[PDB]
Design a protein around this ligand. Structure first.
Ligand SMILES: Cc1ncc(C[n+]2c([C-](O)CCC(=O)O)sc(CCOP(=O)(O)OP(=O)(O)O)c2C)c(N)n1
Ligand SMILES: Cc1ncc(C[n+]2c([C-](O)CCC(=O)O)sc(CCOP(=O)(O)OP(=O)(O)O)c2C)c(N)n1
Ligand SMILES: [Mg+2]
Ligand SMILES: [Mg+2]
Ligand SMILES: [Mg+2]
Lengths: 542, 551, 543
């Protein structure tokens, strides 16, 4: 059958392209490439992950992709797949995650006369994906086997290149259709991809004078810039650090920088937003890819690297370092003097328990910010967070997939050491949102060293710190923003046969130092009724 | 009053004037103007607010609130993936023709593509699944044209409601209503006591559009041997009431001459009248796939199903000439009695409680006035197999796409709307019962739909029966492709998820009982509860073979 | 050959669905259904129209549909076809024209890796079409011939149903794909009947309206006929069918104080109409068919499909309106007589005077369609066409040509032994230059027998003289960027395409229209726009 030959050629090319994991869901029909994928899974060339929940499957693919940087395929055939995959595909587009969405249209059947069990289509594919490629239906022609093998492998390498950003430096989701009718020609020698894409550079140098009082702000997707390593740097948790001179986010409003270098895409902290929008401050955007971040439109120039003249005034560096120490002190002490555990205490504890080579996975809301408020030093750490569109959905499967991909890479190094830990920190709403991600059949890969820390303040803590958190809304905000739920986390973990423990904040460190089952949830109860006061006390101690 | 608060209050007001009684809300900062406005309407009793955490299952809750009493229902959420999480419920609402209003907050459209946090292409995200995609203009600070802005906001809100209820189209469905909103997003400390721009006098909708009467008479001769097949969304046809009728559980009965689905392949209809959209029964599909028998499609709206290649004509109602042969009605009535007798006998002779036994017991417990919610895979198949008489009861099921998402939330939402509709009657009697029958995989999958926050409305009389055979009604009853497909390997091992632990996790009363206690337990109440009945799946294929042999 | 069987089944069902005309263009590959359509053309079962310009070809299809109300197919395979069809597809959506766009995708070929010279997609199909249906590849299964013939014919009826609004009362464009791999044909129903028959449908939404309140009727594009409203003063657009005989000149409207408005169809003309419809003190009742209702300001009180009336207009009100109508008809005619130069308004008044029952009238956007209304044309017994969906000045020549062909075809189908009725088109000069391509028709292709295109040529855009940018403080700037003079030799253009042409004066227009010429002719009448604004100022002052 030409369709089975074609499917094996594609799967083979996908494996040479660096795909190591494929996610699937049961549906109305067989998945695309199902048998060739099954053969490769059995042979150990790739690893399959199956889930019933199509939404959590999309996010499992994201995690499997950002854990070690590899392209990941997700393949489902059902009438709800496109709708359920939407959230993950949007995150993959905005965070530039190489996600390949496989489909298998049927050209011998009617479309548009009723509900389609294979693909029920929304409007986001047009706007979200880097490419939409459909292989031909496989012709029955042994005469043309060599020419078809070339066409198929060329097209597969185009899918892979579009998703990884190999030539565009703009990785993201790709829609790859392999049609079939209802009801192996080799690749390049020595395992090379059919169409090889050697390394590319996009170079856009900007002239910047460092003698001007400069602060670096690095956000999601920031590059590494050695020539900027000495400047005071307010770094989001997921930004790689270029140097060793951190500036705490809370210190920023008490300095007066005269220019800003912005790396990647900042999304955290109102003081950062305000500074980038200040008309009297030059802002230089250094980022990869086609677009640049600039909500205010205030930025002066954008490129990919800086060509620097001068150096920072010693008085400026020394003044930034003293506000940095005052902010660190203000947090440590007001946390010490607070009589109730909050998410900020939980984040502080997780940050101390971390060691080099760990992978940290951060939920949206307070956790990703609290870790920054606690001054976590991210050097030697891989920090992952779905900052593309900052959803609270799918964070459990993202952590699981990230642990799996990260352990898989460490395994392949052959090293005798135990698999490096993955530690997730997420809020209680975030955990309830994607609890279904906890359900993993015995037939499926399970992380060996994943700890999910759930900081549970029985609602949405971040909203205590916004305008709706003002006391004049006290009666009203509790229901429509606090959103309390009274979930028994321990029961939920028991229901899914997931090792679970409820501990106090000071036991968090010790518990995380002691290894446990491959996958486990550590719940720490927290309070959010006092959170706006705690943050007010930290500000006043600045 | 700042522009965001003013706009939000005008929109919420016009939605209430348009007949919206329930609103599902999920938390966020960008939708804060909507959340404040809705909670004010809740506090003064103009609507009933339901807050949820998970946008996805929250959309099926809204679906339940819409199908329970027949009213348009809004779900409101923040910008970004929160909106994308409504996709699954939008698809169901489209195919099941449910008046679901997705009311999303957005950033100003000019911020698209600037790197703004939690922003995405929202307008048109759903494509052709929605009846309409409507946007409001960003609210300007310009009091001189407050009354002009009031008119455009209420008109837009009236277009949303008309598209969703099908007031002009006769084709209800979901509508995307996107509202770009900018700071300030919370109500100002001052002015105190501002006045929201007024709607029409006497609470009338700003632009009033009455429900269309859509009519398409079609001639049909009843003397030709006729079977009626009615599926999801079918209408009632008194002049067809005497015909033998294979009716899906969700189809309203027009008459009293039932024909069991198993009997149909053993009869020889010479023509078919197809009511609504029948998807459920394999015997039905086989018959409709046969291009030789003439089929007439009677539907309540402009859509008609593609299940038959030989639909001769479409209509909304038949104009009947003649009457059926008494011998033909005799023949069908005899096969009906035979078909159900085979089922009840083989059921009684089977030594193990299967999901079919649970469905038979549930069907036997119901009385007129009950609402019954069925998970759209096997529970709806089994209840029909057991021969449930649906006269005088409301059967709800997500038969649009018959997916697995949101079945629990839909049961909860149907119960709340149905009880509410009966609070308004004024009867002082206890609220009607809502009984849901859900399989264990479906219940586990949407278990988080059980979650109702302490401050949120709880059904007064919903019982969720879980027929737990520890794995699907899947590889029993087959589906040659499925044994080959590697994704089926998750179905080879019983999942063993503890149902009682799940009900504990969402603080819902749950008991585990035997099928014989089911009838008495349901007559007995107590708010919301789950009854888990364990069940065998191993003998299930043996049971169906015995029924097939008995025919 | 399976696709040959499929293609013939589809063409046969399309024919049974009332398709009489199909528009094609040469392209990189063969049009969908090309050989089945040829066979039907040869046999006189359908009529093929070929054009090289894909854009004019779409507007020709629009004309072939609106000329007698039939569904029309357009079939092009080229790398530019979707882009060139866009304008007509948008017009088909907004004017609710039953336009079927045929395509033929190749499922054995790669998509998305490079330029696609079979169909290069834009973003508009997802927002403009009523349906997008793909037949699916034809396979080699002779036993399933009955089942496949049923499936194909069903899908084709579903396509036709979506395009004509047979069940939705919402006609519009549909995308119909028949994919391709690269003499007995299975029969449809007895007696030429469609495979899935759709009996007549009604959408009924009655509204209670009190006629004793001082009421005016404004009817626009797509207005329906309402007997119970025939006596009210009615400001009608040229394309709106008249219900009665109490016209109310649009220039009269600002001089009356109506206390409620019944609005029929979709109004697009006259700023006094827009002002009245937006007046918060005036209840507005929108009566229209289809899913949506017009309401720019949001001021409307209710919408439906018909009126249930109580009461009757006060006789004082009727005479006040009938007299204000007389005042305005007279102010226009007297200041037209008093005006020194020929303007487009003069040309319109002359064309109005020359029309008679049985004629089809095609109006360009811009001043022509307004001027006919200001000239007080009586449209009873006259079929008035204009592309008011989006009011483009593009494609009006091919629209008039297609309208004429379809209207003539309807008359020839009767046995009448008469010269076919006249189609008279009135368009401005920019509009004519925009779609001049539509004049080029090969000897092989159908040509209207009685089409006369009148071109009111004021060497630019007359309508902008009458707008705010036409005020004298912009005299230097506006000439170039709104007037856009071109100095085209209209007679030389028509001679290049072998089209009978005459430059004539306005009094000469009635006589020339009375005796026929070649089947297609262009009558150019030179007009002035320099004095246009003051002419309208004179008519305002006279009121
Ligand atoms: C699917 C979805 N639906 C809604 C939202 C809006 N939202 C957030 C956003 O405000 C967070 C934005 C950011 O930059 O992190 S943060 C949030 C509350 C999360 O509560 P939590 O998980 O208990 O964390 P907590 O520590 O209590 O802040 C909600 C509900 C969302 N982000 N995703
Ligand atoms: C393709 C296209 N491109 C531009 C426009 C804008 N436009 C118009 C519009 O303003 C008229 C709209 C209406 O309601 O009639 S009217 C117009 C001038 C038409 O000049 P004309 O054909 O010589 O007519 P004239 O009698 O001189 O007014 C132009 C350029 C358009 N309508 N279509
Ligand atoms: Mg929380
Ligand atoms: Mg089960
Ligand atoms: Mg002109």
């Amino acid at each position: 059958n030409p369709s089975t030959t074609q499917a094996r050629v594609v799967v083979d090319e996908l494996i040479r392209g660096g795909v190591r994991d494929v996610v699937l869901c049961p549906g109305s029909r067989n998945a695309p490439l199902a048998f060739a994928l099954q053969d490769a899974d059995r042979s150990g060339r790739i690893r399959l992950h199956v889930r019933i929940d199509e939404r959590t499957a999309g996010y499992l693919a994201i995690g499997l992709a950002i854990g070690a940087g590899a392209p990941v395929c997700v393949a489902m055939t059902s009438g709800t797949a496109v709708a359920n995959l939407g959230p993950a595909v949007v995150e993959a587009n905005y965070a530039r995650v190489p996600l390949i969405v496989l489909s298998a249209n049927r050209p011998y059947e009617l479309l548009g006369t009723g509900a389609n069990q294979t693909m029920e289509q929304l409007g986001y594919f047009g706007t979200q994906v880097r490419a939409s490629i459909s292989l031909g239906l496989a012709e029955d022609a042994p005469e043309r086997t060599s020419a078809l093998n070339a066409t198929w492998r060329s097209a597969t390498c185009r899918v892979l290149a579009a998703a990884t950003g190999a030539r565009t430096a703009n990785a993201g989701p790709v829609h790859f259709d392999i049609p079939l009718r209802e009801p192996t020609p080799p690749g390049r020698p020595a395992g090379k991809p059919w169409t090889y894409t050697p390394p590319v550079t996009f170079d856009q140098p900007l002239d910047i004078d460092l003698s001007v009082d400069t602060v670096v702000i690095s956000g999601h997707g920031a590059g590494v810039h050695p020539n900027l390593a000495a400047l005071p740097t307010v770094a989001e948790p997921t930004a790689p650090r270029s140097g060793d001179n951190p500036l705490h986010p809370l210190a920023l409003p008490l300095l007066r920088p005269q220019q800003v270098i912005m790396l990647g895409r900042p999304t955290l902290h109102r003081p950062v937003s305000v500074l980038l929008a200040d008309a009297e401050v030059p802002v230089f955007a250094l980022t990869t890819g086609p677009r640049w971040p600039d909500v205010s439109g205030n930025s002066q120039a954008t490129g990919t690297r800086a060509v620097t003249t001068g150096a920072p005034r010693p008085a400026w560096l020394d003044r930034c370092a003293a506000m940095n120490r005052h902010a660190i002190a203000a947090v440590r002490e007001q946390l010490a003097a607070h009589p109730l555990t909050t998410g900020l205490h939980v984040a502080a504890a997780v940050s101390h328990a971390l060691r080099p080579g760990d992978q940290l996975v951060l939920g949206a809301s307070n956790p990703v910010r609290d870790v920054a408020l606690a001054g976590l030093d991210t050097r030697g750490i891989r920090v992952r967070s779905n900052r593309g569109v900052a959803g609270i959905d799918g964070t459990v499967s993202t952590a699981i997939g990230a642990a799996l991909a990260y352990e898989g890479a460490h395994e392949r190094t052959g090293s005798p050491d135990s698999p490096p830990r993955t530690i997730a920190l997420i809020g209680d709403l975030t955990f309830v949102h994607d609890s279904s991600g906890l359900l993993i059949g015995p037939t499926e890969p399970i992380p060996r060293s994943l700890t999910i820390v759930v900081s549970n303040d029985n609602g949405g803590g971040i909203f205590e710190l916004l305008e709706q958190g003002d006391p004049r809304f006290s009666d009203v905000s509790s229901r429509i923003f606090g959103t309390p739920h009274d979930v028994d986390v321990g029961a939920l973990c028991r229901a899914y046969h997931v090792e679970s423990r409820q501990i106090e904040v000071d036991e968090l460190g010790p518990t995380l130092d002691q290894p446990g089952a491959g996958m486990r949830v550590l719940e720490v109860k927290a309070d959010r009724s006092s959170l706006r006061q705690l943050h007010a006390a930290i500000k006043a101690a600045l």
